[PDB]
Amino acid sequence: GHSYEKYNNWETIEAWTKQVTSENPDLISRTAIGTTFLGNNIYLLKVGKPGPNKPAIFMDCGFHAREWISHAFCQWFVREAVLTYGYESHMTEFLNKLDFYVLPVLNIDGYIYTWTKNRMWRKTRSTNAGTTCIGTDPNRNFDAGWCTTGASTDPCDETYCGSAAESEKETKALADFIRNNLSSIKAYLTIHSYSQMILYPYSYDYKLPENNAELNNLAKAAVKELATLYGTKYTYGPGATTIYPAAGGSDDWAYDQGIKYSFTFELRDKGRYGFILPESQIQATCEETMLAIKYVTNYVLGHL
């Protein structure tokens, strides 16, 4: 069955999205924002106490198939939201004043594949013209300096940027949903591993966002809150100089749509286990990440 303490396969995660919404209709509603290449449903959980014209924070997990602690965290977040609402004053104020759009797994097809065939798969599972090589890197497929740097035009590479921007059903679906909801989404958070980083734009170029100083201080403060629990050390900064130049990412794209608070989160660890983080580390990773997420939420709330 489903556990928050273990990695769950897609069948279990899908059944969980229905069940947790079913058990908490007062705090959660579910939709799909599109389907994947292989016809799976890209679910989105709207977490919050329903009200007219509320602002929102958008968070996705599972961009990259093999980064399983990412998927894990979205599920953890949702449970913590429903558990502490009415019991922990901050989360209670958060759910009352805004919504969280939580997209638990974006790249469902790749995720299934990491379970069925290849644990180290990263990309989507779509076919490509002129080759047998499979998949596009969803985080190289967004219309942000698309395919100009840090991406590959070779479908056989794990940073393949796609035949065109948003060529992928999954990424077009995410981009469509965000455009269509631009006026309410105030922050964009996308969960990855591993590196222990909080990154903001830009990555597709060395330029800096006009609110660079704000973004940097918020990341700084977030990294601090995160450390308070277990002393886990994160680093922070513009993607381009903080890890590497890479075009077509969703964080940069979201920011250029006008969402001023845009962050990629790289969770545990720093390489000892890498993508194959032991399940015994799930709870600790998620707990400390919550503090960073909640700090940002609080900040966004006082800067509407």
Binding site: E67, T159, Y244, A246
Partner: peptide, 5 residues
């Protein structure tokens, strides 16, 4: 998450 950075 690109290998091997």
């Amino acid at each position: 998450x690109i290998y091997a950075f």
